[PDB]
Amino acid sequence: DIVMTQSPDSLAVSPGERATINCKSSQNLLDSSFDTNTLAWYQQKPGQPPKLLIYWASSRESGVPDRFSGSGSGTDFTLTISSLQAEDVAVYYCQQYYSTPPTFGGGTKVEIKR
Amino acid sequence: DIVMTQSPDSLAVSPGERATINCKSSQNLLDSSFDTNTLAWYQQKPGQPPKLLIYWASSRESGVPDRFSGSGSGTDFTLTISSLQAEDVAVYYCQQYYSTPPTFGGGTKVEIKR
Ligand SMILES: [Ca+2]
Ligand SMILES: [Ca+2]
Ligand SMILES: [Cl-]
Numbered sequence A, B: 001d002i003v004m005t006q007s008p009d010s011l012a013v014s015p016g017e018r019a020t021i022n023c024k025s026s027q028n029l030l031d032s033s034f035d036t037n038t039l040a041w042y043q044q045k046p047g048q049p050p051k052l053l054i055y056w057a058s059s060r061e062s063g064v065p066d067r068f069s070g071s072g073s074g075t076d077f078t079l080t081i082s083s084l085q086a087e088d089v090a091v092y093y094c095q096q097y098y099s100t101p102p103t104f105g106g107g108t109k110v111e112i113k114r
Helices: none
Strands: A004-007 A010-013 A019-025 A039-044 A051-055 A068-073 A076-081 A090-096 A108-112 B004-007 B010-013 B019-025 B039-044 B051-055 B068-073 B076-081 B090-096 B108-112
Touching: A004 A090, A010 A019, A019 A039, A019 A090, A019 A108, A039 A068, A051 A068, A051 B051, A076 A090, B004 B090, B010 B019, B019 B039, B019 B090, B019 B108, B039 B068, B051 B068, B076 B090
Parallel strands: A010 A108, B010 B108
Antiparallel strands: A004 A019, A019 A076, A039 A051, A039 A090, A068 A076, A090 A108, B004 B019, B019 B076, B039 B051, B039 B090, B068 B076, B090 B108
16 A cells, blocks of 8 residues: 655744645655646644645645645655644645545644744 | 445436435544544545545535535444535545544445436
8 A cells, every 4th residue: 555654743833934744655646647646735623624735736725825835746745834823733634645545644733833 | 443434335326316325434433522423524526635525424514515414423424415416426435533644435436327
C-alpha cells in the first residue's frame, strides 16, 4: 500500500508567521501523463471530520483563504499557511487519492506559539 | 485497526428513486455521554478527492441538499439519497474519525439506471 508521511507531527509559530508542513508519498502521485497530482490537503478542527482545502497539490477549494497554498509534485509536497491566524489552529492532513479509498498521512497539529 | 465495510460496492436506481448505502464499523463510534458518532459520509466525483456530506452520522454539511440523510449509531450506519439526481452519480464513502488519521470504507459507486 501507499505510505503517506508528514513532517513534523506538530508545530507552532507566532501569530502572523508562516507555517510549513511536509508530506511524502511512497508512490509518485502524478496522474497518468498529466501535470496534476492526486494529492490533497485537509483541515480538521476538534471533534470534526477533515474538510478539503486543496486538490491537485495546489488548487484551492472554493471558499478556502488565500493564505493556504500547496506545492510539490511527484512524491514530496508542502502545505504552507503564509500568515497563521487563530482560526487556523487545527490538524492538517495530506491525502493521496490514487487508490480506492484514498488514505491520509498521519496529520500535523498546528498551533499558535505563546 | 478499525475495519470499515460498505455494502453494496456498486448500485444503480432509476432517476428519482431512493438509493441506500450501508456501512459497518468494527469499532463502536458512539460516545454515549455526548450522543455523537465519529462517523461521516463523503462524496467523490471522478478525478477529485472526497468531499464531506455528513458528520456525526446525521448532520448535513452546509450546502448539501436535503435529499441526503444519514442514520445509524455505534457500528452500523446508512446513507440514504431519497431522490437520485444525475449530479449525485459518484462514489460515496463512510469515514470513521475515531482514530488519527481517519479512515474510509471501501466506497460505493452510485449510478442512475436509465
Ligand atoms: Ca427502478
Ligand atoms: Ca447518551
Ligand atoms: Cl470537504
